[PDB]
Structure formats: C-alpha cells, structure tokens
C-alpha cells in the first residue's frame, strides 16, 4: 500500500492469506520497539554483512527488490534473531533493565546511560560484541562514553562509570 | 504664648536637587557584564549543539 501518511484513516484492512509454499517460512522477530533499540548496536555488530547484502540486492533490482531479494531478508531476520536469543541467554536482567528505562524515557539513549554501560559490558564479555558508531569526532570523547550527559533530565551518577572494552578498573 | 519658632530657629532642610549617580546604572559596567553573559552563553551553546549533533548521529 502507499507510503503516504494517512490523514482520514478510520478503518484497517487485513489479509489472512499466507505466503505460498514455494517461499520458505521464517519466524518473524517478536521483539518490540524498546528491546530492538537496546539491541540495535549488537545487531549491527553481528549482522552488518547480511543487512548490507539485503540493501545492495534491492539496489541491484530497482522496482523488484521486494520479490527478488527474499532469501536475503530471511537471512537478516534469522541473523537478528540470533543476537536476541544470545542477549536473552546471557544478559537477560541487564537487557531488560535497559529497554525498560528506554520505554520510560522516550526511547532516548542519552536518558538511560547507566543501564547501557552495564548491558554493554555484559554483552562484550559474553557475546563478544561491541557498540561502534562511525565518524564520531576524534578530539571529543564519544557521546555514549561521556560521563556527563547535557540533555539527560536525571544527571548521570558519579559512581556509574562508562564502559570501554579492553580497559580494566 | 503664640506659636513661635524655637530660640535659635529651625535647622535647615534639604531642598536642592539630589539625584546622585549610582554605579548600578552606568553604561560601562552594564555593557561589560552583558558581554560576559552573552559570550559565556554562546560558549555553552557551542558545547550543547556539538553534543546534540553527536546524539543525533547515534540515534540514526
Ligand atoms: C561597583 O563596583 O560597585 C557596585 C556597583 C554600584 O556601586 P558604585 O560604587 O556606585 O559603582 C561605581 C562604579 N563606577 O554595582 C555594580 O557595579 C553592578 C553592575 C551590574 C553588574 C552585573 C550586570 C548583570 C548582567 C547585565 C545583564 C544585562 C544588563 C542590561 C539589561 C537591561 C537592558 C534593557
Ligand atoms: C546576538 C547573537 C550573537 C551574539 C554575539 C555574542 C558572541 C557570539 C560569538 C560567540 C563566540 C564564542 C563561542 C565560543 C568559542 C569557543 O567555542 O571556543 C572553544 C573552541 C574549542 O574549544 P573546545 O575544544 O570545544 O573545548 C574543550 C572540549 N574538550 O575554540 C574554537 O572553536 C575557536 C574559537 C576562536 C574564535 C573565537 C572568537 C570569539 C572569542
């Protein structure tokens, strides 16, 4: 259906018809918005090649990406389920601690920095995955590793410290 | 006796114009302190927007 944002939508239309047997089935990701934002930088750190392969396939078949790149899409869904399972079997308390703060904080990452710095160190030492943001200014300390967040309503506590992989306490 | 002034007369009153210039309202200190507020405010603004653009990079 159209990508226009609706202004007079009073109804919703569904379609109980399933994808044909010729297309392999993929169990869809069951995670909601707040968990997916807390795991995004770990999805990226593990599924970049698959994510990058899907999008390059769609740019290789203009106007036909939906129908001719289905295998890549199943591959991204599977790759991104692996991280979700991995975070669950190894970081379950910290992961919930982070995306619950995110739900109460407008999904703003700067508003939940102490929960991210705990979840990230649990992910780094268990799933060996590390949050990387490209082209951050080199002079300035990265914003996700800054002790003081200027846009945070509750000030980051002095005891809570940022997590940098490869550095001990 | 009638209502008379006291023996030596009353002491002088204040009638000459008296509007003494107070340093609270001088155009040098007000301009200077305005410049300090206005220069510090732009300093914090440079820090703020630089951080918000970095916060925007992470969200994207
Ligand atoms: C001065 O050092 O002593 C205190 C002074 C008033 O005492 P005085 O001894 O009379 O000052 C003489 C200065 N030649 O009082 C002062 O020097 C204080 C002067 C004010 C300094 C702070 C200014 C606050 C920031 C200015 C905000 C913008 C000012 C203009 C806003 C109005 C515009 C509509
Ligand atoms: C009405 C609206 C306009 C009102 C006008 C009032 C004044 C406006 C002009 C504002 C100029 C001052 C802005 C702040 C200057 C500044 O940002 O200097 C700091 C910057 C580098 O400092 P930085 O490395 O970011 O700090 C340490 C971080 N670890 O250094 C620089 O970026 C270079 C600064 C050199 C030029 C500064 C000239 C003004 C002093």
Q: Does A45 contact B at CB distance below 8 Å?
A: no
Residue of A nearest to B58 (CA): A133
Asked if B58 and A144 count as a contact pair (C-beta separation under 8 A), the reply is: yes
Q: Does B35 contact A at CB distance below 8 Å?
A: no
Whether ligand 2 lies within 6 angstroms of the CB of B39 is answered as yes
In the DSSP assignment, the letter for residue B23 is G
Please state the φ and ψ torsions of residue A81, each to the nearest 5 degrees: -80, -30
Taking the centre of ligand 1 as the mean of its atom positions, its distance from the CA of residue B29, in whole angstroms, is 5
Which among A124, A129, A136 is positioned nearest to A168, based on CA atoms? A124
Asked if A109 and A143 count as a contact pair (C-beta separation under 8 A), the reply is: no
Query: What experiment produced this structure?
Result: cryo-EM
- Give the separation between CA A129 and CA A132, rounded to whole angstroms: 10
Residue of B nearest to A135 (CA): B57
- Give the separation between CA A51 and CA A72, rounded to whole angstroms: 8
DSSP string, A128-149: ------TT--SSS--GGG-S--
The beta-carbon neighbor of B55 closest among A137, A140, A143 is A143
Report CB contact under 8 Å: A151, B52. yes
DSSP string, A32-69: -HHHHHHSHHHHHHHHHHHHHHHHHHHTTSTTTHHHH-
Distance from the A98 Cα atom to the nearest Cα atom in chain B, whole angstroms: 16
Residue of A nearest to B44 (CA): A150
Helices (H), chain B: 27-59
The number of helices, as runs of H, and strands, as runs of E, in chain B is 1, 0
- Give the separation between CA A154 and CA A107, rounded to whole angstroms: 15
The beta-carbon neighbor of B58 closest among A109, A137, A140 is A109
A21: left (phi over 0), alpha (psi -120 to 50) or beta: alpha
Terminal-to-terminal C-alpha distance of chain A: 53
- Give the separation between CA A55 and CA A34, rounded to whole angstroms: 24
Asked if A109 and B58 count as a contact pair (C-beta separation under 8 A), the reply is: yes
Other beta carbons less than 10 A from residue A161's beta carbon: 14
């Amino acid at each position: 259906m159209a990508t226009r944002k609706p202004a007079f939508n009073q109804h919703v239309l569904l379609d109980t018809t399933p994808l044909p047997d010729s297309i392999p089935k993929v169990k869809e990701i069951g995670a909601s918005s707040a968990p997916l934002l807390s795991a995004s930088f770990f999805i990226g750190a593990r599924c970049k090649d698959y994510n990058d392969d899907y999008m390059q396939c769609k740019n290789e078949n203009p106007g036909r990406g939906e129908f001719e790149c289905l295998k890549e899409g199943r591959r991204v869904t599977r790759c991104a389920r692996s991280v979700l399972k991995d975070i669950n079997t190894h970081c379950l308390e910290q992961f919930r601690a982070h995306w619950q703060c995110l739900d109460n904080n407008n999904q703003q990452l700067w508003q939940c920095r102490p929960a991210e710095w705990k979840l990230n160190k649990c992910v780094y030492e268990n799933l060996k995955l590390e949050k990387v943001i490209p082209d951050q200014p080199k002079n300035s300390t990265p914003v996700h590793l800054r002790q003081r967040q200027i846009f945070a309503h509750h000030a980051i506590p002095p005891w809570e410290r940022p997590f940098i992989p490869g550095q001990p306490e | 006796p009638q209502d008379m002034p006291p023996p030596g007369g009353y002491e002088a009153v204040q009638y000459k114009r008296n509007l003494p210039s107070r340093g609270l309202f001088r155009p040098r200190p007000l301009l200077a302190g305005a410049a300090v507020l206005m220069l510090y405010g732009w300093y914090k603004l440079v820090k703020g927007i630089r951080e918000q653009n970095e916060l925007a990079r992470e969200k994207m």
